[PDB]
Design a protein around this ligand. Structure first.
Ligand SMILES: *[C@@H]1O[C@H](CO)[C@@H](O[C@@H]2O[C@H](CO)[C@@H](O[C@@H]3O[C@H](CO[C@H]4O[C@H](CO[C@H]5O[C@H](CO)[C@@H](O)[C@H](O)[C@@H]5O[C@H]5O[C@H](CO)[C@@H](O)[C@H](O)[C@@H]5O)[C@@H](O)[C@H](O[C@H]5O[C@H](CO)[C@@H](O)[C@H](O)[C@@H]5O[C@H]5O[C@H](CO)[C@@H](O)[C@H](O)[C@@H]5O)[C@@H]4O)[C@@H](O)[C@H](O[C@H]4O[C@H](CO)[C@@H](O)[C@H](O)[C@@H]4O[C@H]4O[C@H](CO)[C@@H](O)[C@H](O)[C@@H]4O[C@H]4O[C@H](CO)[C@@H](O)[C@H](O[C@H]5O[C@H](CO)[C@@H](O)[C@H](O)[C@H]5O)[C@@H]4O)[C@@H]3O)[C@H](O)[C@H]2NC(C)=O)[C@H](O)[C@H]1NC(C)=O
Ligand SMILES: *[C@@H]1O[C@H](CO)[C@@H](O[C@@H]2O[C@H](CO)[C@@H](O[C@@H]3O[C@H](CO[C@H]4O[C@H](CO[C@H]5O[C@H](CO)[C@@H](O)[C@H](O)[C@@H]5O[C@H]5O[C@H](CO)[C@@H](O)[C@H](O)[C@@H]5O)[C@@H](O)[C@H](O[C@H]5O[C@H](CO)[C@@H](O)[C@H](O)[C@@H]5O[C@H]5O[C@H](CO)[C@@H](O)[C@H](O)[C@@H]5O)[C@@H]4O)[C@@H](O)[C@H](O[C@H]4O[C@H](CO)[C@@H](O)[C@H](O)[C@@H]4O[C@H]4O[C@H](CO)[C@@H](O)[C@H](O)[C@@H]4O[C@H]4O[C@H](CO)[C@@H](O)[C@H](O[C@H]5O[C@H](CO)[C@@H](O)[C@H](O)[C@H]5O)[C@@H]4O)[C@@H]3O)[C@H](O)[C@H]2NC(C)=O)[C@H](O)[C@H]1NC(C)=O
Ligand SMILES: *[C@@H]1O[C@H](CO)[C@@H](O[C@@H]2O[C@H](CO)[C@@H](O)[C@H](O)[C@H]2NC(C)=O)[C@H](O)[C@H]1NC(C)=O
Ligand SMILES: *[C@@H]1O[C@H](CO)[C@@H](O[C@@H]2O[C@H](CO)[C@@H](O)[C@H](O)[C@H]2NC(C)=O)[C@H](O)[C@H]1NC(C)=O
Lengths: 674, 674
């Protein structure tokens, strides 16, 4: 298994090394590094001519002269002041006329501003600026290790750095601390191996997977809710569509993990009753432990009355719009069948900039999601604008760790899916592919297993004045057994009459509902996980297609550590996926953990005529190369019919799991010491 | 597989035919039957000299002159008036000087009294009277089909009888109605195939198994809570022990079923909060449907205020007694270490006759169990002393159907197990068998599966005047897939120093807790299901014991329908087990349904010195042939020690399940019509 690579020129390489020079030892400043001198004395005012937008720069300066979030404090985009500052900073980065002015602005920020705040605006700018297109971003877990690993292993790294090494390596092994080469390796367990407060803990290997969490972070920085989608041209008109697709797909995938663990559907809650599923983040900031929400949390308390009424009102509005058939307000009146209605509900639920026709949201345009994250996070109200007790719900990099995150968005998609039943359902004729028929589909054995995975966590530690004189160590390694599966083929048999360009899609869906009974397309159309999308020229007669799971376009390879990125740069290359598909879900997670006896699911292949791609979303996500609605044909209900189309095939499938069932078993000292 | 038989003489054979003559078409009277003429004119008063207790007879006559529960009304021993009348009836039967007087009294009852009331006292008298010892009892599901099969199938039988056969056999098949020979067979689903109101429904194949339920009914009539245990001699002093053992074992067996179904530990509840798991009995009486308790039932309502205070007080008394190290009241002072302590707590929790040192319980001796069943049953207060809306908790034959049954007794055994930690824990020395060592234990593959089981359900129907002139039809058969498992051997390897008489016990226990983590003997000693108990002579050197599951003494063969009993009688024979082990749990249920991949458990063999059997309980249950406390050595905690005793062995074991996972699949017309 070789990783696909891509060729880059000398300019790109030079810009790549520059951006990476600002992603090192992020919680500390190195006066020996070139960036410190540049950044410390950069005069934004004096170079105001090197920015395409003078107003944005002046607003930044005006804001900056008043002070920004101090260093070391936690930064969260869900807090007004912090967000506005971060956004002003983003504008300073985005409007730099050229890479050089941008780099200097970045260095300025790195030296003067809050590390978290800088990293946030930095990450987004690299994604948004045209001149940095293709630039490979370092893994978020490598940049925010304190957000991707529990305190028990963070504390072990702290103890190692404080002791300046291992004092008794033979004893350290019993605490998962091993030395390999010149690296210190830390075997890190998911939380279900240290605390089991509720049954949802059984899903910890999935909800705490660094790749899954990185995936949500990438989703957000690819296109922040506070920013307009203008830059992406077409996506703007299809933004709400993308919202639905992303969350439906994520919720459905999470649902599958629940199913193979016997946890049933995503729980429903009320803002007027205790929230059943609590959550205890084993994370910490530099000033406080993350807030905890005990099981059966009394959410309807005096501190949340007003917020709950707002959330209620927000839901009420939508439900009433569905009833009367029209969305009023926001400067327009949309009937449910309007051609922009789909984008409206999506933008409405997310309360994004595009809902208002602006480039950035304002503080007074209150958000359902932000307020809901606030009350579900269970944190006491902020001490002040710059100080708050964070919860898993305050970061896109830790959101998926909280069971209520899925419950919140499942509630939202719940309404979105209700809205979809008011639309014209897909007719049997529009779904039919005259001349095309799928005679059979055979799927190879589906097997999951846990496999060790390492990543650089050195950013967890603080370097010595002497250590800063020499090259960075990239000394610490965090090792966790992560979910994965064996590659598998899908053999498709297609009997055709005429020759035509066809599109073939591969989905994965449940076979039974939570109670073990047969699924129903009428109520379960939204439970199909899109796995593949590709064009294929169908020749008259017999057509045999073989798609290997490693080829599914929906997923990407694991990221490589910054150190391997450099070696690859010497060759004038960059990982293909890491550069162009950084937002895709890691392929090692395309399958939910199976069971020893094999858990029931079904694959489905659908092939339809290839045609218009005039309003595709390639500038956003590469695989979106058609005009059909995202998730087609499971994007909305379908005109109930008891006789399936010949161009769609459903194949039963079983997901088995090999090796140790529980991930923590691979971190038992007796085991890894062999 | 041949069923063990037993030889019986002419006297026995004649009495067996007499007792069975009163178990036919029980809801109807046959004036053509000999018993009718006998019973209709039998004069109890005139024969008073034929009973060994004249007071008992006069009390029955005095009571009977005021009236008894009318025919067709539902009978339940949990209602005062009904119980008192039944007990008087039981005394009339128990004190008959000889079988003939007994028979005539019974015939009198069958003609004049409420069917259910009669069957109840009849069943018990047959078990208690010395001259009827060994008499075979008909299966309870054959006598009370309307309490062992849901109404959907009962209504089908009614339809068949009203039509006097099938009007369209070909159509009837699609509804589970089939004709085989001269029988009408009805495929009957467990409730989870028709309504899935909560996750507990997943357990319906077990909680509704007719054998499991019959088992509870037999436990009761064997020795009612309202009767003293005097007749059984030693049982009286060890009654409490027997109470703990019966329920703990049953709760543990049920816990195993939850485990392989991902349902965790037995839920805990509060009398002051909504009861989470509801229950919908798909049963009916002749006047009303059974009462239903919806999920999240508001149990703390004005109707239950006083009852709940009584229940709370009952529990407080016990908790405080434990805290102060002594039980006070009920005519004595018992410190926790008193030899009479164990029986006191069991008799206290059951509020039985022996708690008071009386023959039978009185109306004012309020029962925790009866009141708890009253409020958990959720039925509205009784219309009057003879009329009430029944719940599954009003019958020993339907109790195991209701999830709260296990929650109630789990709560009670929880208190019993807390009491046991105040006693002297078995020391390692007493557990040690000097010179005996179990080197190894090997268990054959553990495999479960569903298999069709039939029983006579003709009592569900009413016969015609003409049909009554001829022999009873035994026309209707109920067919259901019931749990079962393949036979398996356990090879025990023992290394002895000298020769001795040893006792060997076999238990099945969980391997992991509900969260999937290792079990702990300090906290899970009460979770070991006793499977076998037998004496074996040990010779010096190497010993090898091979026990087949069909040999385990704790279980019994399934019961035979009454028609088969007659045929066997012609040869002067009766089924061995049905005769003297009717109270045992059906062996086809000794193993919980497994999983396709195999669910983890562990078998443990323990061998100790065979000695004293002075206070054994053979008169009650055959297998209780020792002096040791029931469930030894897991009858109480053990002096925690990380080093295993040589004479005890634990072996990991996996229970797989073959064929269809869901029982209802075997009742699908397309399936059984082949
Ligand atoms: C415990 O607990 C407690 C309780 O809580 C606490 O306390 C707290 O504390 C805190 C802290 O400390 C505080 O705060 C702080 O304060 C301070 C002071 O204040 C004041 O003052 C100021 C100043 O003044 C001045 O200036 C101005 C302008 O701007 C003017 O106007 C005036 O006049 C003056 O003048 C002067 O100036 C100068 C001096 O400085 C010179 O030039 C001369 O001298 C002249 O003359 C000011 O500004 C203020 O103001 C305010 O206030 C007032 C009243 O009072 C008013 O009127 C105003 O308006 C204002 O106010 C307000 O407004 C509003 C309201 O309505 C709001 O917003 C608020 O409130 C405000 O405030 C006063 O007066 C100060 O300074 C500081 O600041 C800082 O921080 C912040 C945040 O926090 C920011 O924003 C800013 O920007 C700053 O920053 C900085 O720092 C930090 C730390 O802290 C950091 O992180 C950052 O980064 C930065 O850094 C920088 O700086 C520093 C110093 O400062 C240095 O050091 C550094 O350096 C480094 O680094 C670099 C890089 O970057 C390198 O290169 C090097 O090398 C190294 O070295 C840098 O440079 C703050 O704010 C408070 O207050 C308290 N609270 C209370 C209640 O009290 C404590 O802390 C604790 N403790 C423990 C231990 O934990
Ligand atoms: C709708 O809804 C409504 C509402 O809920 C309902 O109503 C109800 O109904 C019911 C039912 O019907 C009712 O009840 C009833 O009533 C009746 C009447 O009463 C009256 O009367 C009586 C009687 O008297 C007499 O006797 C005595 C003695 O014992 C004396 O003393 C007197 O004087 C008299 O004498 C006379 O008469 C006689 C006749 O009888 C003769 O001998 C001569 O003539 C002389 O002179 C009485 O007892 C009563 O009393 C009472 O009351 C009073 C008041 O008024 C008082 O004072 C008293 O004390 C008494 O008691 C009381 O007490 C207490 C109080 O505190 C309480 O506990 C209560 O209250 C009581 O009451 C009167 O006066 C009656 O009779 C009836 O009875 C019956 O039943 C029961 C149960 O229920 C029982 O227990 C009994 O025993 C009886 O039984 C019977 O019947 C049944 C049915 O019913 C059955 O099941 C059984 O088994 C039995 O049977 C028998 O008999 C019959 C008749 O009756 C016949 O028929 C039969 O036949 C058969 O048999 C065999 C088989 O087994 C064969 O063999 C043959 O063939 C066949 O036929 C048998 O025999 C009851 O009780 C009520 O009341 C009502 N309620 C109201 C509010 O009103 C309705 O019903 C509905 N409907 C629908 C449709 O659903
Ligand atoms: C009054 O409200 C209107 C609309 O609600 C505001 O107009 C918007 O202004 C923003 C500039 O911040 C534009 O980006 C939008 O396109 C405008 N939308 C509409 C519908 O006009 C207007 O700014 C408000 N009045 C004032 C004085 O600000
Ligand atoms: C008052 O109550 C006491 C206690 O319940 C009764 O005493 C019992 O009497 C019976 C005689 O039938 C004895 O067998 C018991 O051993 C006694 N128990 C105790 C604790 O003493 C007493 O009989 C009752 N008195 C009356 C007049 O009914």
């Amino acid at each position: 298994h070789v990783l696909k690579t891509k060729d880059v020129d000398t300019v790109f390489v030079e810009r790549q090394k520059k951006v990476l020079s600002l992603f090192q030892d992020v919680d500390q400043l190195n006066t020996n590094d070139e960036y410190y001198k540049i950044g410390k004395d950069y005069d934004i005012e004096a170079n105001i001519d090197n920015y395409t937008n003078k107003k944005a720069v002046e607003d930044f300066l005006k804001m900056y002269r008043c002070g920004f979030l101090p260093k070391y404090n936690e930064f969260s985009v869900f807090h007004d002041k912090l967000r506005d500052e971060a956004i002003a900073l983003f504008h300073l980065f985005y409007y730099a006329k050229d890479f050089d002015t941008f780099y200097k602005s970045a260095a300025f920020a790195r030296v003067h501003l809050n590390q978290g705040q800088f990293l946030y605006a930095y990450y987004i700018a690299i994604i948004q600026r045209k001149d940095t297109y293709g630039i490979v971003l370092p893994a978020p877990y490598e940049i925010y290790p304190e957000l991707f690993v529990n305190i028990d292993t963070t504390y072990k790294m702290f103890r190692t750095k404080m002791q300046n090494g291992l004092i008794n390596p033979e004893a350290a092994v019993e605490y998962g601390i091993v030395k390999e080469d010149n690296h210190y390796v830390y075997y890190s367990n998911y939380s279900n191996a240290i605390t089991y407060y509720n049954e949802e803990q059984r899903l910890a290997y999935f909800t705490e997977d660094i790749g899954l969490n990185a995936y949500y972070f990438f989703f957000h920085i690819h296109l922040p809710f506070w920013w307009t989608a203008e830059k992406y041209g077409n996506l703007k008109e299809r933004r709400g569509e993308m919202y639905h697709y992303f969350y439906d797909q994520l919720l459905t995938r999470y649902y599958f993990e629940r199913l193979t663990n016997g946890l049933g559907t995503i729980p429903e809650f009320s803002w007027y009753s205790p929230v059943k599923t609590g959550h205890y983040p084993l994370l910490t900031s530099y000033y406080t432990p993350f807030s905890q929400r005990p099981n059966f949390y009394n959410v309807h308390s005096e501190e949340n009355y007003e917020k709950i009424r707002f959330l209620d009102a927000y839901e009420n509005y939508f439900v009433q719009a569905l009833q009367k058939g029209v969305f009023e307000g926001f400067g327009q009146t949309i009937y449910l069948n309007d051609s922009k209605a789909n984008s409206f509900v999506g933008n409405y639920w997310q309360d994004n900039a595009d809902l208002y026709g602006e480039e950035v949201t304002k503080d007074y345009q209150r958000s359902y999601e932000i307020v809901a994250r606030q009350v579900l996070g269970a944190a006491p109200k902020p001490f002040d604008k710059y100080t708050f007790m964070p919860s898993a719900l305050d970061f896109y990099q830790t959101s998926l760790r909280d069971p209520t995150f899925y419950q919140l968005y499942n509630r939202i998609i719940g309404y979105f899916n209700q809205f979809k039943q008011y639309l014209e359902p897909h007719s049997q004729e529009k779904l039919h592919f005259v001349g095309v028929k799928v005679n059979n589909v055979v799927v190879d054995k589906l097997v999951t297993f846990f496999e060790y995975y390492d990543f650089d966590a050195t950013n967890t530690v603080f370097l010595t004045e002497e250590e800063l004189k020499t090259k960075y160590p990239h000394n610490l390694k965090v090792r966790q057994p992560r979910l994965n599966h064996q590659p598998f083929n899908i053999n498709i048999d297609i009997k055709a009459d005429v020759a035509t360009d066809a599109v073939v899609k591969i989905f994965m869906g449940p076979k039974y509902n939570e109670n073990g009974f047969p699924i129903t397309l009428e109520n379960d159309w939204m439970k199909f996980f899109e796995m593949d999308w590709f064009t294929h020229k169908i020749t008259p007669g017999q057509n045999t297609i073989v798609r290997n799971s490693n080829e599914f376009v929906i997923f990407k390879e694991d990221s490589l550590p910054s150190t391997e990125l450099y070696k690859l740069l010497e060759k004038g290359k960059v990982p293909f996926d890491m550069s162009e598909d950084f937002g895709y879900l890691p392929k090692r997670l395309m399958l939910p953990r199976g069971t020893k006896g094999g858990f029931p699911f079904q694959f489905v292949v659908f092939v339809y005529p290839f045609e218009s791609t005039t309003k595709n979303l390639t500038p956003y996500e590469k695989f979106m190369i058609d005009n059909k609605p995202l998730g087609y044909p499971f994007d909305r209900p379908v005109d109930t019919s008891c006789f399936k189309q010949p161009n769609i095939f459903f194949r039963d499938v079983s997901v088995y799991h090999e090796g140790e069932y529980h991930a923590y078993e691979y971190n038992v000292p007796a085991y890894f010491s062999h």
